Amino acid sequence: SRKTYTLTDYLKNTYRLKLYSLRWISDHEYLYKQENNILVFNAEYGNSSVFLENSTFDEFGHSINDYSISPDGQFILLEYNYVKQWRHSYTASYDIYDLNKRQLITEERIPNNTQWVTWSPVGHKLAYVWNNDIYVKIEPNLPSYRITWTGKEDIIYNGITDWVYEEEVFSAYSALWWSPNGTFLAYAQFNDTEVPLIEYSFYSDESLQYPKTVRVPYPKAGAVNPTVKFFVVNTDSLSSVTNATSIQITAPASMLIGDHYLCDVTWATQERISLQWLRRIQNYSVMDICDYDESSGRWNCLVARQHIEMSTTGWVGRFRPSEPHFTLDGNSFYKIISNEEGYRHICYFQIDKKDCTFITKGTWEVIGIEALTSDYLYYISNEYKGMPGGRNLYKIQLSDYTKVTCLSCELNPERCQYYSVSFSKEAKYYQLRCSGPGLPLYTLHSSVNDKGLRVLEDNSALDKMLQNVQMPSKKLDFIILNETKFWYQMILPPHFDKSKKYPLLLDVYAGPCSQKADTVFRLNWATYLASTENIIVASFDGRGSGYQGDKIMHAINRRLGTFEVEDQIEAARQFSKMGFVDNKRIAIWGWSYGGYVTSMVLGSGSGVFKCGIAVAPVSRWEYYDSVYTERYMGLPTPEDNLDHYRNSTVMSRAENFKQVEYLLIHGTADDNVHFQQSAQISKALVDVGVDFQAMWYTDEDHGIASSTAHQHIYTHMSHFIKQCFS
Amino acid sequence: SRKTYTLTDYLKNTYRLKLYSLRWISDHEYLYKQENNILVFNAEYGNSSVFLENSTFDEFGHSINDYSISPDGQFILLEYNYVKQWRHSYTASYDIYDLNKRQLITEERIPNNTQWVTWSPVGHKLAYVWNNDIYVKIEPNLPSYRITWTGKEDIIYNGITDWVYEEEVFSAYSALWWSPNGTFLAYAQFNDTEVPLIEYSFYSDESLQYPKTVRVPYPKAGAVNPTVKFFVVNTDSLSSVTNATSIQITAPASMLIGDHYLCDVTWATQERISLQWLRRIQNYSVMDICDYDESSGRWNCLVARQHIEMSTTGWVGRFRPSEPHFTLDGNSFYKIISNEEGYRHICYFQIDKKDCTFITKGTWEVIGIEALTSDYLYYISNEYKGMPGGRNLYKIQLSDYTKVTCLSCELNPERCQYYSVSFSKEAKYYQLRCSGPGLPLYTLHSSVNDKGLRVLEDNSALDKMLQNVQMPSKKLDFIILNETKFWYQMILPPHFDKSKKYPLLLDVYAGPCSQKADTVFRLNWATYLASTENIIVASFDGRGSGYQGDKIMHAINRRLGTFEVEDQIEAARQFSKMGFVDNKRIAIWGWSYGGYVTSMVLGSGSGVFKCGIAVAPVSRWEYYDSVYTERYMGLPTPEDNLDHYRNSTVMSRAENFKQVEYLLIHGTADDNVHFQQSAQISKALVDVGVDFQAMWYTDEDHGIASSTAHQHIYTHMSHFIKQCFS
Ligand SMILES: *C(N)[C@@H]1CCCN1C(=O)[C@@H]1CC[C@H](COc2ccc(C(=O)O)cc2C(C)(C)C)N1
């Protein structure tokens, strides 16, 4: 009877998930965007009022892609002429609209091609980066004060991250941090002078006669890394007749002895800032807590307030050392660190005490600290039901660590096992966001008694829609391997009949600290495969996976391309013996790290898989960036880990591809996993006489996300899967 | 019964064609190489003697890939450390071995990375190019005289051609011409200073961490072209204390007025040299005949000895103006030029007479002038049987143009209809080389009475081998289109049964002045398709084809991508109505220009073809080099031919690919047809939502000729054809 979730439904997004993206502007109100206008809501009662009409900018002349209201409510930042760069970076044009006089500020406007803009935390001050230099605007209509003068494209970055810092550490283009009340503006400076450049052709539109060459400072494993410097400027000291003086915060000496990185910056108070550094060998990290010296104007980082965080089993943090959450006075803070038992939990520190006290414990982990009041600490964890793939909001009484309360567990057990949260300014209210296993559910609550105020969005519309279609179900469970249990998931075709034998597709990523087996509800390609082609799509989290402790996560330390791929093969081997799996039709595919694993698997010689697809795969670790690779592989030198760097390439397994059908895909403008990686794979396959299918995507990057390329790759991959199974 | 010509037989070359490559060292003897040693033969009797034993260089230390014996027989040039560059260019190392003293010359040796070396025509002088500069060596063991000092990589080329001159005009790296007795050394100089650079990535071996960027001066259609200068130096005036003086030969004034090219250089006598120039608009060409002035030391080119050659229907020459063949005294010459009727024939000129006299005529063409004696002129033509695809050696009495004799026609009518020839120094003897329709046959003759002396090679070995295999046959014939008849050929499966219906593959090239329909015997991929897969492989020569007069060849003037592709579609349409052709299984494929035509055809919307394969295709003429493109397309400017340049792209036809199965293939290091061309095609296909198969070959160039890549592409293409037909 009736329809199924088709490929076209996925590519054309016929069944959409409704969201409820709000933005707290205070401890009592939040702004709520809409395709037309922006409304302001009162958390307590729910009543609203238009903040600015959808018509205020009808004849602005440009297509605005984003707004940013100053903390004052007095101004609105208008963003247009958006030009995407990397995963987070982009340039655009900006105009400021005065809400008090309802006029568009025309004087001393923010230059075009601005790399980054941000209001101060409280008033309406502005800090932005242009041509790699920092500028501060005390008043929207007043001239800008140039803070830095050393900016130089591809060389010196002031206030913005270079390629690797953007992608691997801060996950942001921004490299500036305003102090709590906006008095100080802290920023980092990156020097890429000796960083090697990755070069690749960009064809551009047909009209371009000669292909251009794109080059970007990109440090590959073991190469020269960018250096970093940190500064803090007092925005209340700007003149216009004198150049602003930036106080530098150097060291630590234990870091200066060699290559290192700035990995975190968090203000503690109006005059206290914490900085976290990491050695190139991401084994050891140091936290500095620097206080402003009223009489010297300098920033002192008292050794005594330095906290060392290191690891003997691997690297520090999931992807980097976690951030600290200070108490109002800044004399103490909480932060997630690995247990003595290897599990990440919240540890309570005294800025001057060397040993911290854990306040949570157990065979589970704290995903993140969400909010801190003088009374309670709110955090997300996968403790409930001992399910590593579930997430719940908990709160712990700071005066009695024995009193912990789960705020999300029982709201709707059936429908919700995965939550994210958004607290208001003073944590007076919070919005819970349930993303599965059922349809996304957004609700509002008040912290005084954790009372449920109301449902903001329940996706009732989509719900009525999906009951007219034969949707697939999701099975979350585990299998045991050497005493240890590992979770997996399966998107089961509708009317799943354990009697019948289904072809199985193994959806894999499996990079360090990853999780592909969870309770999240998704509408993707896998949905179509199960619903329309009656294909079972499975995912498994083996050695290397995260949120299950360092014993599992650090198992692939200095040894990438080993256990995580073995466990993948093993999981599929067990699946093929389940009764409803046609072991003669088992495939595997992945993207980026998932492309690497997929290739390593297909070239393992296990014969377990018939065909596989690798999209933008890593082929050899010496080709990927230093910050990521080295974190798990160390340095590619003979004295260090060169041997394993060379033992874990995809091309060395070239010969074994004779037994499988392989589809290799890659964007030619991939700035992240360079086309080079797939170029070497295809060449190793040719040199060995192995036939395979290939597809390049001209000018597409790592996401192969343009509207047309996206539909084309999934369409192309569907034909390949259908053919390999039918 | 028994085997067939398999794909593996083609890729592994199990059935080899024997050759007989000889080299005339005089009018009576020729050298004959062998995998081991070199022998010297006496043409008159056939007796031989070893010239140099296969052991003379056992402990040389290097792998010699080629030898060159000086005209004296006194020295041997040894070539090793061969590093290929473009289609003709390459660098290598050289050593000279003295045959008189049987020693290896160790003093003043030729530098490594030498770009070009050549003995003088008579003695043992040497001229070579290193680091783009010319050097002359009067004696093998004496210091070299540097002739030029302006050489500069990618900028100034002395004695060697730049990229476009190598590929499009001289079909050689060499740009130096010794005078008949070695007294003068003429050379060209190319300046690429403002020539744009094509840039592309070269991945190299896996060990390379960062992909390198190759850039080469390459003028695309309409771009800035390289400039050229011509010089002549007297090698008998070299000192060692003074810099050699090179006399320049400039003009013509009718050429200097704008962009032009040097397209031919031919010495007439010891002191007379002829030069041919061509305007950027390859409509008009001028020939200069310059005499050495004994008392001025200069070279005078007397306007009166200038011969203009232009065309009103198209460009000049088949690919460039033909070369002249002077009479012993140099006061007259013969050269192939287009008729009043449009057919190319030999015209007799008086260096001082404005009008030449044709000595051959008819609805056929002279392919080339092979030899000239004071008595006879020997030439190759396709006159015999009125077959444009056949070739025969003829000789015409210079005293009675009415007396022409075919020297090859009746030697073996059945087996031989395609001949090439090689005369000795004074044309006392000639070697005929039959390449089809039967197995290659090499024979020797004496010019006195054109008597057949003996068979040098008859491929008797391969003959016995091929009778144990089910080989295909070749049908050469024609079809009529608008009064005019056009020839085609078909490789018919063994035991061809006109009753049965066979799938047909259209092998196409069809660039201007091409011929894919001939009587040549070939052992290639097409042989396998017909023998093993029972596929008919056809080729058709329509408008644009050569050797049939300018009315057919110039039909696509300034209009590439029109009639040559239309006729291709039309030829296939007629084939599909022949009775033994399954019109439901007709494919088309080609390489380079053939890739362009194949794409244009598949995107025509004719629906005649089910699938097609394009290898390294041109996609839009603005992306190809100027010298070639402009010769047929003019300049891509609005005032000229920009409109047709834009109407003849493959991407504009993108939408029509929905009806066909397309396989796109290209080498990423193609320096000739840049990967860019296929990158734009694939992108235009993605933007329109058309699915297709693709395959890139990392680091392979236009030939995709490495041992592994070659076998891989044909293997990959075979799977595609088999699937499209079965
Ligand atoms: C493919 N997946 C390639 C090949 C292995 C490493 N690859 C990466 O892309 C790595 C993995 C981690 C990092 C990307 O990190 C992020 C991207 C996006 C966000 C986000 O919040 O949107 C966050 C991250 C972090 C927090 C750094 C994991 N580069």
Side-chain angles (χ1 to χ4, degrees), chain A residues 199 204 206 209-210 213 215 218 220-221 620 622-623 676 679-680 682 687 690-691 694 696 698 712 716, chain B residues 199 204 206 209-210 213 215 218 220-221 620 622-623 676 679 682-683 690-691 694 696 698 708 712 716:
Chain A
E199 304 183 306
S204 188
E206 192 182 324
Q209 195 171 208
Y210 286 87
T213 299
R215 50 254 298 185
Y218 183 115
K220 288 178 181 282
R620 84 136 48 170
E622 284 164 82
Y623 300 154
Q676 158 196 45
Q680 294 292 185
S682 68
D687 291 351
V690 170
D691 185 48
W696 74 78
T698 136
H712 192 289
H716 194 63
Chain B
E199 303 182 305
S204 188
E206 190 182 325
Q209 194 169 209
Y210 286 86
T213 299
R215 49 254 300 186
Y218 183 116
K220 287 179 181 281
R620 83 136 48 169
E622 283 164 84
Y623 301 154
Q676 157 196 46
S682 68
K683 184 155 60 72
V690 171
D691 185 47
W696 74 79
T698 137
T708 52
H712 192 289
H716 194 62

Side-chain angles (χ1 to χ4, degrees), chain A residues 16 415 439 458-469:
Chain A
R16 211 158 331 219
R415 176 177 183 172
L439 302 176
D458 66 3
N459 271 297
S460 56
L462 176 68
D463 185 57
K464 290 296 294 292
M465 266 183 219
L466 298 185
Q467 58 199 188
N468 286 306
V469 55

Side-chain angles (χ1 to χ4, degrees), chain B residues 503-523:
Chain B
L504 183 146
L505 202 201
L506 188 58
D507 190 332
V508 55
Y509 180 68
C513 197
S514 70
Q515 181 167 71
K516 288 279 280 177
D518 57 41
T519 61
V520 180
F521 177 80
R522 301 188 179 84
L523 250 36

Side-chain angles (χ1 to χ4, degrees), chain A residues 398-413:
Chain A
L398 276 40
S399 74
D400 195 324
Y401 308 150
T402 293
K403 298 179 185 179
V404 46
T405 306
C406 184
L407 306 177
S408 60
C409 297
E410 261 50 63
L411 299 182
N412 192 323

